[PDB]
Design a protein around this nucleic acid. Structure first.
Length: 77
RNA sequence: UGGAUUGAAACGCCAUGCUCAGGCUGGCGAGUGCGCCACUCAUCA
C-alpha cells in the first residue's frame, strides 16, 4: 500500500509490506498476503488489533479504502 | 502423512588503560618525692 512516514527511524517508509522472498506464504503476489481491501475478496480490517483500530480513527476524523484509512491514520491526524 | 501466514533463517567478524610521579622537611617525657615507727621464742621434764 501507500507509505507511512514521519516516525523517528531510518527511512520513514511503509509497514506491513513484503519486498523479499522469504516473507512468501501460500504464494501471493507481494501484498496479497496481508490483504486489507487491496484485493477485495477479503479484508482483514473490519470486513484487539491495531490497523482495524486505526481505521476506526480515520473514520472518526470524517464525521483499498481500508489501506487508505489506516495509513492516513498512522499519518497522524 | 496435504498445508500450523507454515516450512529454510549466527549478531558475526576484531580492539593496552596506557605512559610516570619522595610523604616529605623538623620536635626533652620532663621538672620532684622517708617504707616509715614498733614487736621476749618464749615457759619446761
Amino acid at each position: 500500500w501507500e507509505n507511512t512516514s514521519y516516525i523517528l527511524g531510518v527511512d520513514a517508509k511503509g509497514k506491513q509490506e513484503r519486498t523479499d522472498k522469504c516473507h512468501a506464504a501460500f504464494i501471493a503476489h507481494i501484498k496479497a498476503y496481508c490483504d486489507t481491501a487491496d484485493q477485495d475478496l477479503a479484508a482483514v480490517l473490519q470486513f484487539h488489533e491495531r490497523p482495524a483500530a486505526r481505521q476506526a480513527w480515520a473514520n472518526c476524523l470524517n464525521r483499498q479504502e481500508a489501506a487508505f484509512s489506516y495509513v492516513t491514520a498512522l499519518n497522524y491526524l
